[PDB]
A and B are shown apart, each in its own frame.
Chain A
Amino acid sequence: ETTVTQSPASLSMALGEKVTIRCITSTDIDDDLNWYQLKPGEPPKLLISEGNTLRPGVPSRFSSSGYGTDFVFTIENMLSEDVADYYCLQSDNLPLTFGAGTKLELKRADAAPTVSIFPPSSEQLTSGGASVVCFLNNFYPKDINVKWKIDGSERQNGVLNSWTDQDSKDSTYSMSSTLTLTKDEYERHNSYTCEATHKTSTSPIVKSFNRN
């Protein structure tokens, strides 16, 4: 098979910067390389076909070069709408093979999270469960720590954190933290604290409530 090694795995580019993705094939494929752009919830979109051929409608900031084994895909100047996964696809011989993909993220200014905590709803407590939810919204960069405290004591077990993808409007990230307990144990404690520590502010952002 023609192995297709796409490089690098991930990129963080600021607005207006040039994007360079390389793609190395294990066999000579002339210029039968194609570049697809994949966004969450949508099928792949072909941007450049064999012979560095820009597809109709694709903006001119997209281009490609290479003949033989070494190929390059370039975004002349980065836009926010270009945040996506990119794949090369060799069309020279069967079987068709894709590159592993490049995850391209936008490099924006740092932004602190907006934190809010939510006690269990009345409906869930009636069903015998108790989830405490904390939302950490619109922060950058993506790395963030969340710490749960029950009556001041740190709690590690029973926590689930889900990260959202980079927002297309403001390029920030958001994270959901959920601490699930039994209703019996939830009623045995008074205060529930959600502590968010991000690179932006050295001291944590603390939101809490008391079960009253």
Chain B
Amino acid sequence: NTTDNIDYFDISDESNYYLISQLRPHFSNIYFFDEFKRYASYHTEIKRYEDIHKTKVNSLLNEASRAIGICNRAKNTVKGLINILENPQKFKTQRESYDVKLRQYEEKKEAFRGCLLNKNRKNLDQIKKINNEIRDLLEKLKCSQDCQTNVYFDMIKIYLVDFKKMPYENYDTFIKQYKNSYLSGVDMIRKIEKQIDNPVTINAIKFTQKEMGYIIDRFEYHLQKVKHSIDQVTALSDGVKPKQVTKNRLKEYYFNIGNYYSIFKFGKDSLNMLNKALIHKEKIVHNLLGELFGHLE
């Protein structure tokens, strides 16, 4: 049938340090900046971060949102080709071959993913700018060799409660079931295409499967990132707990658990979106198999 939402496309920069998502806040570092607002509220020395978050961090999110909206025309272009390539009825109303429209799909797909990167390059430079400000701002803690770790371990306790709110094993179970069904359908389609002569419908199935493979890859990437965050933060909870550390280590402490938790929330958002995307593609495939086998008369 039709795909009316293509939020599953994302892209990373060339250095592979930043990942751009069409879901707010588009960068995982925004979630880290939101997490550092919590850390700063427990230190009277660094509570001037209240002003930094509402100016620089709030502006970065708005600029990221405006950047994503710029690519809306390119988004509609891809979405257009997708609806023709997965619907044999709409495809027969035009005269270009399936190979030709598939090439157009790849070009318009990469022009759109290229747009979300290109229009967000300056927002990337600002992220590194804000991180170093937070580092310098943490220097004003009134300690040196005996910086208390109570705030650091208090947040770890909070994060374990937050981890338990995510049904990770259901996500893992679902990705393995639909990956298995997807791979089984791919091998199935290459055998029955020799038996049933319906080139248009067969190709619509193959295109949707191509999109399913992409969505499965993104789901598996985010599930692994989320698993890594939970495993690492839980290891810190079970580990040795020093009461005092140096100031530069406490900086890494906050940056460590902050980045882990930012990836956990960013991944939770994407996996919830990719789960919906994959389930909608699966129904299209089995709908297309119904049409392939329902008009044999």
Contact = CB atoms under 8 A, between A and B. Distances in A.
Touch between chains A and B, by CB atoms below 8 Å: yes
Interface of A: 28, 30, 92-93
B176 interface: yes
4 contacts: A28-B180, A30-B176, A92-B176, A93-B173
A138 B67 CA distance: 78
Nearest to A53: B231
A30 B176 CA distance: 9
B255 to A, nearest CB: 22
* Nearest 3 CB-CB pairings of A with B: A30-B176, A93-B173, A28-B180
The majority secondary structure among interface residues of chain B is: helix
Contacts of A93: 173
A92 B180 CA distance: 14
Contacts of A28: 180
Nearest to A29: B176
Nearest to A28: B180
Nearest to B180: A28
Nearest to B173: A93
Contacts of A30: 176
Nearest to B227: A50
B168 to A, nearest CB: 13
A28 B176 CA distance: 10
Contacts of B173: 93
A93 B173 CA distance: 8
Nearest to A56: B235
A30 B173 CA distance: 12
A25 to B, nearest CB: 14
Nearest to B235: A56
Interface string B159-186: 0000000000000010010001000000
Contacts of B180: 28
A28 B180 CA distance: 10
Contacts of B176: 30, 92
A17 B231 CA distance: 35
A43 to B, nearest CB: 16
B76 to A, nearest CB: 38
B201 to A, nearest CB: 30
A74 B173 CA distance: 29
A70 B252 CA distance: 42
Interface in B179-236: 180
A107 to B, nearest CB: 38
A28 B173 CA distance: 13
Nearest to A30: B176
A93 B174 CA distance: 11
B240 to A, nearest CB: 13
A9 B257 CA distance: 44
Contacts of A92: 176
A17 to B, nearest CB: 34
A178 B180 CA distance: 60
A69 to B, nearest CB: 13
B239 to A, nearest CB: 10
B8 to A, nearest CB: 23
A30 B223 CA distance: 15
Nearest to A92: B176
B224 to A, nearest CB: 10
Nearest to A94: B169
A92 B173 CA distance: 8
A30 B175 CA distance: 12
A28 B184 CA distance: 13
A30 B180 CA distance: 11
A76 B3 CA distance: 53
A49 to B, nearest CB: 10
B237 to A, nearest CB: 15
A29 to B, nearest CB: 9
Nearest to B176: A30
A92 B169 CA distance: 9
Interface in B140-173: 173
Interface in B262-291: none
Nearest to A49: B231
B228 to A, nearest CB: 12
Interface in B30-54: none
A39 B173 CA distance: 33
A61 B33 CA distance: 43
A92 B179 CA distance: 14
A93 B176 CA distance: 10
A67 to B, nearest CB: 13
A93 B175 CA distance: 13
